[PDB]
Amino acid sequence: MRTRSTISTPNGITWYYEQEGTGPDIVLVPDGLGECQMFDSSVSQIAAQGFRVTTFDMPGMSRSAKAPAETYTEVTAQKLASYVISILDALDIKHATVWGCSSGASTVVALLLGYPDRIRNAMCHELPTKLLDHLSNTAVLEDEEISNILANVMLNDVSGGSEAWQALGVEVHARLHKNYPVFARGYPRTIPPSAPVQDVEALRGKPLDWTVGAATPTESFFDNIVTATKAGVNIGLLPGMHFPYVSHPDVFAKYVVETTQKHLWNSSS
Amino acid sequence: MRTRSTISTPNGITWYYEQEGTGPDIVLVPDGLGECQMFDSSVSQIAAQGFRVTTFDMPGMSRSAKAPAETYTEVTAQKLASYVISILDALDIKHATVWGCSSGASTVVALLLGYPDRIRNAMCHELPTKLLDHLSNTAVLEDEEISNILANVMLNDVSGGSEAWQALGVEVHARLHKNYPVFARGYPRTIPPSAPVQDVEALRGKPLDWTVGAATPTESFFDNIVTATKAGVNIGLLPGMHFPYVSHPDVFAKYVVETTQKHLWNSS
Numbered sequence A: 001m002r003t004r005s006t007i008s009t010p011n012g013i014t015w016y017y018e019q020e021g022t023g024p025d026i027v028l029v030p031d032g033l034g035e036c037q038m039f040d041s042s043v044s045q046i047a048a049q050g051f052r053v054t055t056f057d058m059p060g061m062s063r064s065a066k067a068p069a070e071t072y073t074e075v076t077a078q079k080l081a082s083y084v085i086s087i088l089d090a091l092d093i094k095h096a097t098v099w100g101c102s103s104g105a106s107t108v109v110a111l112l113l114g115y116p117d118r119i120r121n122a123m124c125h126e127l128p129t130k131l132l133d134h135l136s137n138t139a140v141l142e143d144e145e146i147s148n149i150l151a152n153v154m155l156n157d158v159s160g161g162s163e164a165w166q167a168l169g170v171e172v173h174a175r176l177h178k179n180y181p182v183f184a185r186g187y188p189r190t191i192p193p194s195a196p197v198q199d200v201e202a203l204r205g206k207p208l209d210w211t212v213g214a215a216t217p218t219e220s221f222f223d224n225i226v227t228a229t230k231a232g233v234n235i236g237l238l239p240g241m242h243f244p245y246v247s248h249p250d251v252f253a254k255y256v257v258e259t260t261q262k263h264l265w266n267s268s269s
Numbered sequence B: 001m002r003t004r005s006t007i008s009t010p011n012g013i014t015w016y017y018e019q020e021g022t023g024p025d026i027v028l029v030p031d032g033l034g035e036c037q038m039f040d041s042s043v044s045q046i047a048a049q050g051f052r053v054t055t056f057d058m059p060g061m062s063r064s065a066k067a068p069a070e071t072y073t074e075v076t077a078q079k080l081a082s083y084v085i086s087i088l089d090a091l092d093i094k095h096a097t098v099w100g101c102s103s104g105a106s107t108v109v110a111l112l113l114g115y116p117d118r119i120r121n122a123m124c125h126e127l128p129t130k131l132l133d134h135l136s137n138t139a140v141l142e143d144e145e146i147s148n149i150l151a152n153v154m155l156n157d158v159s160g161g162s163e164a165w166q167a168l169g170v171e172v173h174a175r176l177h178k179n180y181p182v183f184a185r186g187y188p189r190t191i192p193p194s195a196p197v198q199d200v201e202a203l204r205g206k207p208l209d210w211t212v213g214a215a216t217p218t219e220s221f222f223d224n225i226v227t228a229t230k231a232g233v234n235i236g237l238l239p240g241m242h243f244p245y246v247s248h249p250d251v252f253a254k255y256v257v258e259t260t261q262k263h264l265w266n267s268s
């Protein structure tokens, strides 16, 4: 029942994408590592509730690596939002609910603000607004040193579930290993300044639902809680840390389904 | 230069208290374990900046154990605030900056709201507003079981610095051993419903500075960040988790001094 295919957009990207189900569109945008197999279990659970679920590897990453250098260097939320709109156009997805974590969170907020006609509602998780010098500084290391250090960081610091993270398996981890240097060079210096949450009044009243991981150290996304509260945006927690779709796929799926259902009800009302 | 003494208040409590320094009064209210030796290093560092610093063991805890049962059972923020005002009265402290964590945070917000003429400014850290059934359920266990469970939770889960926690030393840990059952039976079922943060508008424009531990899991005090932001209260982070005065005593002392100095400037 799952479509697994490729599609090229006129900006030069050949995307790997997956699609399952029929009904209103839900689009799952990856975190900065750009790997959509992390959604595999949740895609089936969401689609089984009457939704068409689409996801894809991000440009330069995993199976979407056939892309121009512009699409994975000096990356901003606004560049990623333009890329996501390009694949939604190619797949004839006119109206979508969107989810994203990390750079995907910055992307879905940029999508909702920039393309309001196209986005039913956005779910953002752990949106990076601050530069982190220790992360930015990995960009000057050799590829194999970046891959070693960031594989260790993802497992031990932010996975929210070491058994589930390792259980992604060799094929996924081999793709992530090649993505770490692309991520490290392209994302950490340019994503946080692009954060589309600097104008709090622009967020007020928008169909946005914001989460942080329950186990994430308070300092990591303290600023997200403050910003969401100042904007009156619904803010809550998911179990785990940065990858709830890996650590707690059933809870993640239920959240996505219940939030989309809430916005479908409010759309008619 | 540290005074270490006792004082009796007419509510029946004989307090163990310490005091150091000369200048505006700063009062350090313990967390629910009620043990003021946790402030030892910070009391000297704060007093050295030109403050009279006072702290005390809480009623029924450590060296303030000579107290009526009502002061350490069915404990609320409003009861604790009334007890702290009693010791400030006895020590002739008319105007005070106050710090508290946990039940001490509930106490200092109840003090600022209930006794505004007495409180220059309050610093609250990690204020519990939710019942936690697993913690509440320790109340029905035997004393030795409560002490073993909670000693482990403090050391391994929420100290924010296990080496600094261990370094409080054998005497402090022997007092905490006896406090754990008193705390378990008197605090976790009654402190959260008494949280003086039900009325967001009552907090607005008050001289309150709120913190959460940087390493504390987001879910523990997520509600504090939301409430402070809704009330326009200054909200920030300290290093560590629930006991910054243990884990990071120099950062803690600098925060208490700089915050007190900010409110002394604004007062004038």
Ligand SMILES: C[C@H]1CCC[C@@H](O)CCC/C=C/c2cc(O)cc(O)c2C(=O)O1
Pocket (backbone or CB within 6 Å): A031, A032, A033, A101, A102, A103, A104, A126, A128, A130, A131, A132, A135, A158, A187, A188, A189, A191, A192, A216, A220, A242
């Ligand atoms: C892969 C995730 C892990 C974040 C975990 C999060 O808990 C810790 C922060 C690590 C930084 C993540 C991040 C930072 C940026 O500036 C840009 C990004 O795209 C990310 C990002 O996508 O990082």
Ligand SMILES: C[C@H]1CCC[C@@H](O)CCC/C=C/c2cc(O)cc(O)c2C(=O)O1
Pocket (backbone or CB within 6 Å): B031, B032, B033, B101, B102, B103, B104, B126, B128, B130, B131, B132, B135, B158, B187, B188, B189, B191, B192, B216, B220, B242
């Ligand atoms: C000793 C501290 C530890 C806080 C750890 C901090 O991480 C919060 C987790 C444990 C709950 C503590 C607590 C709960 C209450 O209902 C009442 C209280 O007075 C406390 C309290 O004072 O607990």
